[PDB]
Structures are given as structure tokens and as C-alpha cells.
Amino acid sequence: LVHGGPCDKTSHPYQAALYTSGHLLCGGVLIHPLWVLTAAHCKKPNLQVFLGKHNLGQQESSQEQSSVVRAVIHPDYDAASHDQDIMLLRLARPAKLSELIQPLPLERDCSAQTTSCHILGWGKTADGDFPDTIQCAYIHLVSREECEHAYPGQITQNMLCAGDEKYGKDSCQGDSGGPLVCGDHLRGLVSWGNIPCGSKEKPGVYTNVCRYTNWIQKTIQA
Ligand SMILES: CC[C@H](NC(=O)[C@H]1CN(c2ccc(C(=N)N)cc2)C(=O)O1)c1cccc2ccccc12
């Protein structure tokens, strides 16, 4: 993510890091002791999930590593447009919850009022580097009308736009599937946006999690 800074160490207990081949692939969000949400475009074989991490270069006493034993991409995901860019990952065992490992409640209300949000991740920064320490930035949800204006004809009801007019804080490569948190609820997932990253003119685009309540429930209860 670009134009942010290191997160407070205790402020992100729901953040997951998704690895394959020993390297960071995506972010993710713990939503249940057995389940992490990420972007559909993150699907690959041999996925490992790290919970409780802050610095990727350290073996942290709070961390837990787990294999993904089932990956359930949304059946209607459209790779070209990123429509329905959501996937549920079932962990090999219930997450060992702690002060630093906690699920984040979902925003189920698609009419929810709160537009002050934040994003987090270990993706690319404004200098091009990939940080060991998780980065955070405050950004704002934009109205559906302003979102449609930024990407004419390319915004569906399954997408939200958010960004920052002052500094252009924005998510980036490596942050996919990370949470857009608004009013301390999960509102969206990092999906797509401008390259180079930066939201001063075109906002980042996020999967609208409130549209997936029923699919999430059916998947978890199957
Ligand atoms: C799963 C592969 C991974 N895909 C992505 O990160 C996606 C997400 N995204 C992207 C671009 C701009 C914004 C924005 N809000 N402005 C948000 C997301 C993008 O372009 O692709 C990836 C792509 C390229 C380099 C990487 C390096 C390390 C780890 C993952 C990398």
C-alpha cells in the first residue's frame, strides 16, 4: 500500500498473509476460526496462511501458520473485470485465537453509513519496495455515483470505491484480498485500481463484502 505507515502492533488481529512457494502472494482477513476471506485472483495450489504476523522477516511468538485445505472461489468470478472477486479459504485447523489473532465482523448492511475506513497490507509502497512491517492507511469510501464516474461502465453492485484525495493513499500489488475496514467492520476486499498505485484521481476498487452474506454462510455451514 502507498503513502501509509507501519500499523500499530495491536490494531490488526484479523489480518492474514497468504504465501505460496515461500513468498508473499496476497493479504486476507480472518472472519471465523476456520475461514479466511481473500480475493478470487489469489487462488493457487499449495497456499499457506499466516495469522498473528506483523513483521514478515521475524519468527513472531504470536504467529500461527496453517495450510489451506479447501479453497472456494466464488462461482461467478469474472477475471477480466474483477466482478465477484472473492474466495473463502478453509484453514487446516481452527485458528488459535489470542489478543493478536481475532476474526473481524462483517458489514452486512449494504446501506451502512460509515465512510471513514482504513486499509492494511504488505504490498508495494510508493518507493516500489515491499515492506517487512505491515502498513496501514486511512482512506474514505466514495459514493456509488462518484465510483461510476471514475470507471464508466466498469463498476458493478459487487464493487466499492475508496481513496484519499490529500495524499493518494491506496492499496497496491501484494495487498490483494486485504480488508477495507469501515466502522470497525469488514466492508471490502482489495481487488483492483490504478497502476501506478495512488488514489488522488482514480479510487481503488474493492469487493463489496455485504453482497456475499448468504454465499459466505452457505459455504461455512456446508
Ligand atoms: C496475486 C498476484 C499479485 N496480484 C495483485 O497484487 C493484484 C492486485 N492489483 C492491484 C493493483 C492496484 C490496486 C490499487 N488499489 N491501486 C489494487 C490492487 C494488481 O495489480 O494485481 C501480484 C501482482 C504483481 C506483483 C506482485 C508482487 C508480490 C505479490 C503479489 C503480486
Numbering used by the authors: 16 to 36, 38 to 67, 69 to 125, 127 to 130, 132 to 147, 150 to 205, 210 to 222, 222A, ...
Sentences from the paper on this structure:
The kallikrein-related proteases are a family of secreted serine proteases, a number of which have been implicated in viral replication. KLK6, associated with neurological diseases like MS, Alzheimer's,5 and Parkinson's,6 and with the migration and invasion, and thereby metastasis, of tumor cells, has also recently been linked to the zoster (chickenpox) virus. We recently reported the synthesis and biological characterization of highly potent benzamidine KLK6 inhibitors DKFZ-917 (1) and DKFZ-918 (2), with pIC50 values of 8.6 and 8.3, respectively, and good selectivity over related serine proteases.12 In order to perform more advanced preclinical experiments with these substances, and to be able to make them freely available to other researchers, we required larger quantities than were originally prepared in the hit-to-lead optimization process.
We were pleased to find that DKFZ-917 and DKFZ-918 behaved as expected in a KLK6 enzymatic inhibition assay with pIC50 values of 8.51 (8.49–8.52 95% confidence interval) and 8.22 (8.18–8.25 95% confidence interval), respectively (see ESI†). To better understand how DKFZ-917 and DKFZ-918 inhibit KLK6, we solved crystal structures of them bound to human KLK6.25 We found that it was critical to first co-crystallize KLK6 with the peptidic inhibitor DKFZ-878 (see ESI†), before soaking with DKFZ-917 or DKFZ-918. The oxazolidinone carbonyl makes indirect contact to Q192 via water #143, which makes hydrogen bonds to both moieties. The amide bond sits directly over active site S195, and the carbonyl forms a hydrogen bond with G193 in the oxyanion hole as well as water #1. The amide NH is engaged in a hydrogen bond to water #36. The ethyl group nicely fills the S1′ pocket and the naphthyl group extends into the S2′ pocket. Furthermore, we solved crystal structures of both inhibitors bound to KLK6, revealing their binding mode.
